[PDB]
Design a protein around this nucleic acid. Structure first.
Lengths: 131, 84, 113
RNA sequence: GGCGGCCGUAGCGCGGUGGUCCCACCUGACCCCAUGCCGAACUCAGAAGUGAAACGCCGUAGCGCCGAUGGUAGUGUGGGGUCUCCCCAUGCGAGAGUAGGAACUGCC
RNA sequence: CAGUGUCUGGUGGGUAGUUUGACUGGGGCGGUCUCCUCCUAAAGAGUAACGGAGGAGCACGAAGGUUGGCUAAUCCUGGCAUCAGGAGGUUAGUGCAAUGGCAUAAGCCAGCUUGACUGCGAGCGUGACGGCGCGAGCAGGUGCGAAAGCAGGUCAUAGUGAUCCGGUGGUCUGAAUGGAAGGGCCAUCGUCAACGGAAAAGGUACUCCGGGGAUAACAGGCUGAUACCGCCCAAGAGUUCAUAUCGACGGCGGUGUUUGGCACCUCGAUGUCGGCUCAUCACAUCCUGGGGCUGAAGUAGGUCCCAAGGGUAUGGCUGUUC
RNA sequence: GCCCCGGUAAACGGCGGCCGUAACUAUAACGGUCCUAAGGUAGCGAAAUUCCUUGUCGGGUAAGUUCCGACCUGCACGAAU
RNA sequence: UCAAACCGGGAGAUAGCUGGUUCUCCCCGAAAGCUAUUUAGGUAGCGCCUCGUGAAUCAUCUCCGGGGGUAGAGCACUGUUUCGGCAAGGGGGUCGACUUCCAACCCGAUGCAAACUGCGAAUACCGGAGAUGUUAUCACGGGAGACACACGGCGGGUGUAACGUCCGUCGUGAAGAGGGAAACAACCCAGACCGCAGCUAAGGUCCCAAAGUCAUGGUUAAGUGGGAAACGAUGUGGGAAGGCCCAGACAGCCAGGAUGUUGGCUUAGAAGCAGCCAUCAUUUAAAGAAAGCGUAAUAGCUCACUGGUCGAGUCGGCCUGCGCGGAAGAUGUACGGGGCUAAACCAUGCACCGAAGCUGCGGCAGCGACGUUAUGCGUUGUUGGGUAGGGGAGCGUUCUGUA
RNA sequence: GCGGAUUUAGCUCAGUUGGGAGAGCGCCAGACUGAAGAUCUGGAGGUCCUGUGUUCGAUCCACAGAAUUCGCACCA
RNA sequence: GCGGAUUUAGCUCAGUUGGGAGAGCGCCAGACUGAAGAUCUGGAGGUCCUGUGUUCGAUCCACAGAAUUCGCACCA
């Protein structure tokens, strides 16, 4: 699927947004996912809102990858109208070795349980990384 | 009137250009090659364009410009057979 | 190609380089006038003479007039013919007409150039 | 400052310092000459005052450009398996990184 | 008047022919057939589709040429018009759909001026093929410039079109001569923009024949967006209590009974729906029976699994099937 | 002969839309406002001639897109089409 | 017989419409584009079969001298878009300071693109020289077929879709044997003269079946031997890493697990355990105002923590191999069968059967070379599959010559 | 393309005596009516297609150009 | 779903030289009339569908969206 964006027509809005956590200090942690895959904005919200709703203990939870690749669909016959932007909103491109969610935290992992809850929402076997 | 709808060029036809002028045999002072019109300077072999280089050779005849900013548009300095 | 800084100042001349001959630059100063016969590939000056050197002969009046510009042309050209040059083009970078440069050129021909 | 050589690593910015030899600024426009409206341009003349803009030297490599020592991803090409896919052989190697050059050289 | 013969112009269904092209997610409706300039064309070239974006059918003596001076947008400061200063390769502008080029400039301003000359060749368009166009010489001569040099119209690529006939510029031409009417070579202008080009519209269930799947309306097959059903997470409702019926948002699947439907299979044709009547071969079920969950305290119910063993035997309106 | 004007619709025909008053609600009824001149009062009308329409009310029947009566803005019904 | 008579007559009407179109053998052996044509399932000049003539030296599989810019990549037009820092503007709350919100700019990390880029292939491709080749390339002219390829898979583009239009890769139907794959257009290997001998390839090699029940090593045990998925699993095997370990712990077994307090608030009620905030103190070896089950609310039952006993491997965690749950339907069920712990399967290897394959003995064709008048012979290189179609040989046959 | 007609103040038009530019309607005002209407009276409003030429002077002559309209021609 | 038309001050509508937002009616008021009526005069009344883009400036260009209407398509 040739990477896409817009410069076309305006579609729906972002189901995501709340970056959460404080960004006064930049860290280098994360949660890598072995395997490339396209994740829609919605599923990203469910996973993000899953951990954020569990890491009430603190914060410093952040995400680097965001959906920037639109995908249109077409319901009915066919013969006039390339594609409209429906349920299929922006989608993020994840690399075989890309870090998605990283939380600035020293060995006190209380979010591993949160990342686990989210790891069951995105279609891809993710693994927990300390580095 | 004014233009709109941003974009690159604007689609055309099939490129009409060749590359006549062996410049290693007999060569009458005329346009050596064909791609883009309007250009002067080179009076002999002056094949010089950014890259690995360019070249031509042998042909005694005053003046002999190129096509334009293409196959060595730069103007070198004289050149002929070896003893016209 | 783009226009070099020299071409932007149009002080040079590529049309005189395609021939493969020499030039006859005419420098002018509010005190003295200079002339040279420089050849392509750098600033190769074969022969040259200043109006101040004209005094060596027997010059009295000022050296910033027209009659002086003509005297220098005969000197620079005379020395040129002694060198081995016959033909030469005029190269006056920025100037008016009928000025001192014209008298310099007319003097060069009077010698044999 | 004069006078040469090599002659696009001398693109473009920036620093120190020196010669009343030289040179722009500056100064003055009686005249040659000249501005459609303006000696500003143009052109001519004298040199009070500096170096605040040349030049001679010389100190940074930013950025452009031209070379050199090291190498992962990517990629050329021909066989292997494998659900997709991936692997091997072989010629190189993104781009990052370590360095070279801000002139060089003779004479008065 | 007439009768009438002949001819001309107008009116003239009263009479007769689909002749009126194609593409096309069958066809029809809606959209397209000349030409220029990105992407698509997958680094030459060339390359399609009612392929996504946008235009040309003209305008102009100047938006031509040369020279002098000048250099722009835009932003900041003092007063959005103006003026002064600073920043500013330039994003300005350059006639036109875009790309490419350009600033002591092909850009702007001003002045001057006007090469859009005549004649004849060589070269360019894989692969032969005309008109036309362009780059580059020669011979003789117009404009501007000191000169080199620059022009064959407007920076380059769209603004165009035959034959016949007519109107316009030198000559040639018909027993024999004069006076006229007539007949060609080269070139320019006038129309065909359904624009390589006809002077001008329409129905057809009485149909026939020669062919073709290169033509649809059904059944089968693929897909399944729609449709049916299930699963994951679970907000929330539930007096309190997610998870004990219900169950949104979102995500992941199965079936293909529904529907829309990409035309390789049959239209050299397996005549259409439903019912009826008759013979043959099976199971994702309501009660009863055996079970799971329970918003299952008990009772009474809700939902789901299993099961054919037996039984599914009837009317009124409509030809009608649900 | 025709352009000219006029007559003629038992000539081919055309008769859309809106507001107010007024009703528990919807419609009909009346006037206007606009468009294209009028916009329909006799009868009778969704009738074999109205889509929407198995139109609305109702008879009748256990029930009837059937039928009959009425209302009826009359998609594309209406005058010897 | 009529939306139009019959018979004959000028019709053996005109058709870009269908069908038809019959002997043997030998050689070679397709394509689906352009310009114009009353032309588009037609020709001519041309892309392609074949034959004759003419000219002349390359061509391209290579290399060398140029032109393009796509994939990819990078990061890029535009139009979106993530975070932080700095500066400027506007609005609101209190002080002309600051805090909060919104839009634009720059930098770093983050990054974005159907219409981009600091960089950047493969690759195809114009012109000129070579190993190879020496007469190929190339120049001319004649006679043709011809400008209706499609389908399956994968990746697509247009397309809201039908047994597509239109591109790309591959592969077949084409022009392919033989052969295995159970059967099979394309998967693997490998290419047809005759008769014959030997040895190999396909594949097969325990038996029917012709060939070793062959060698080394290993796995599975499932008979898996082949549909199978999103999802689950201390079935089992292997590897790395944290903590606790024999000065009685980590887990078992025995007994505690308390006091103010039914913490406050809230709530019909909640007294560790709906929810809202705290979560201290007490006795002290331990006991969190309490991690779960449970009650309408209590009660009750465990855990955390500690002691005794038990005396030893235990606990949390990461990765990898294979199988499995998610799987109900049709008159008798299984890999070709028998059947095989390998007579399976996986990783290799060896010997054979097995092709009209390869090699050898007796009998060919076409093209080119040498010698030749020769297309007659001799020798030499290539040797021999074929539909449509092109070319060539041939014999059966009748009648009339001359012998 | 060819030929005819037409091209006067907003609108519709008269005006060939070459030497007055005018009428109706419309617009404004006055008079009248209680007022409004309609008469009626008054005023304003004209590059009289454009240029040039002919004459002393032309809307009203000649020539050239343009507009509008009609007939015709063309509309491969 | 597809295409065409339409979407200006309360109502009905004109308005393409892109740079004036206008007409009729209605509403309020003035005038007049004893007064009310009707003229007549005056004023108010318009995100000129919406956003964005384009231009020195757009109701009057381009793009996207919404509404109304008509034809067509769908309707076990």
């Amino acid at each position: 699927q040739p990477k896409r964006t817009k410069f076309r027509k305006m579609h729906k809005g972002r189901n995501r947004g709340l970056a959460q956590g404080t960004d006064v200090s930049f860290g280098s942690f994360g949660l890598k996912a072995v395997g490339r895959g396209r994740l829609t904005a919605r599923q990203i919200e469910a996973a993000r809102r899953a951990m954020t709703r569990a890491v009430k203990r603190q914060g410093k939870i952040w995400i680097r990858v965001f959906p920037d690749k639109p995908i249109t669909e077409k319901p009915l016959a066919v013969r006039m109208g390339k594609g409209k932007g429906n349920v299929e909103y922006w989608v993020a491109l994840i690399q075989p070795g890309k870090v998605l969610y990283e939380m600035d935290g020293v060995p006190e992992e209380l979010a591993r349980e949160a990342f686990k809850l989210a790891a069951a929402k995105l279609p891809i076997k993710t693994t927990f990384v300390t580095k | 009137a004014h233009k709109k709808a941003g974009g690159s060029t604007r689609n055309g036809r099939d490129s009409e250009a060749k590359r006549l002028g062996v410049k290693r045999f007999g060569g009458e002072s005329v346009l050596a090659g064909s791609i883009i019109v309007r250009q002067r300077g080179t009076k002999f072999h002056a094949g010089a364009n950014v890259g690995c280089g360019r070249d031509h050779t042998l042909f005694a005849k005053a003046d002999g410009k190129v096509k334009f900013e293409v196959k060595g548009p730069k103007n070198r300095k004289f050149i002929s057979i070896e003893a016209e | 190609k783009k226009s070099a800084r020299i071409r932007r100042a149009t002080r040079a001349r590529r049309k005189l380089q395609e021939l493969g001959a020499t030039r006859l630059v005419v420098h002018r100063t509010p005190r003295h006038i200079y002339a040279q016969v420089i050849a392509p590939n750098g600033s190769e000056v074969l022969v040259a003479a200043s109006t101040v050197e004209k005094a060596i002969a027997e010059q009295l009046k000022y050296t910033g007039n027209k009659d002086a510009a003509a005297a220098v042309g005969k000197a620079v050209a005379e020395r040129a013919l002694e060198k081995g040059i016959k033909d030469v083009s005029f190269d006056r970078s920025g100037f008016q007409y009928h000025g001192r440069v014209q008298a310099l050129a007319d003097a060069a021909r009077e010698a044999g150039l």
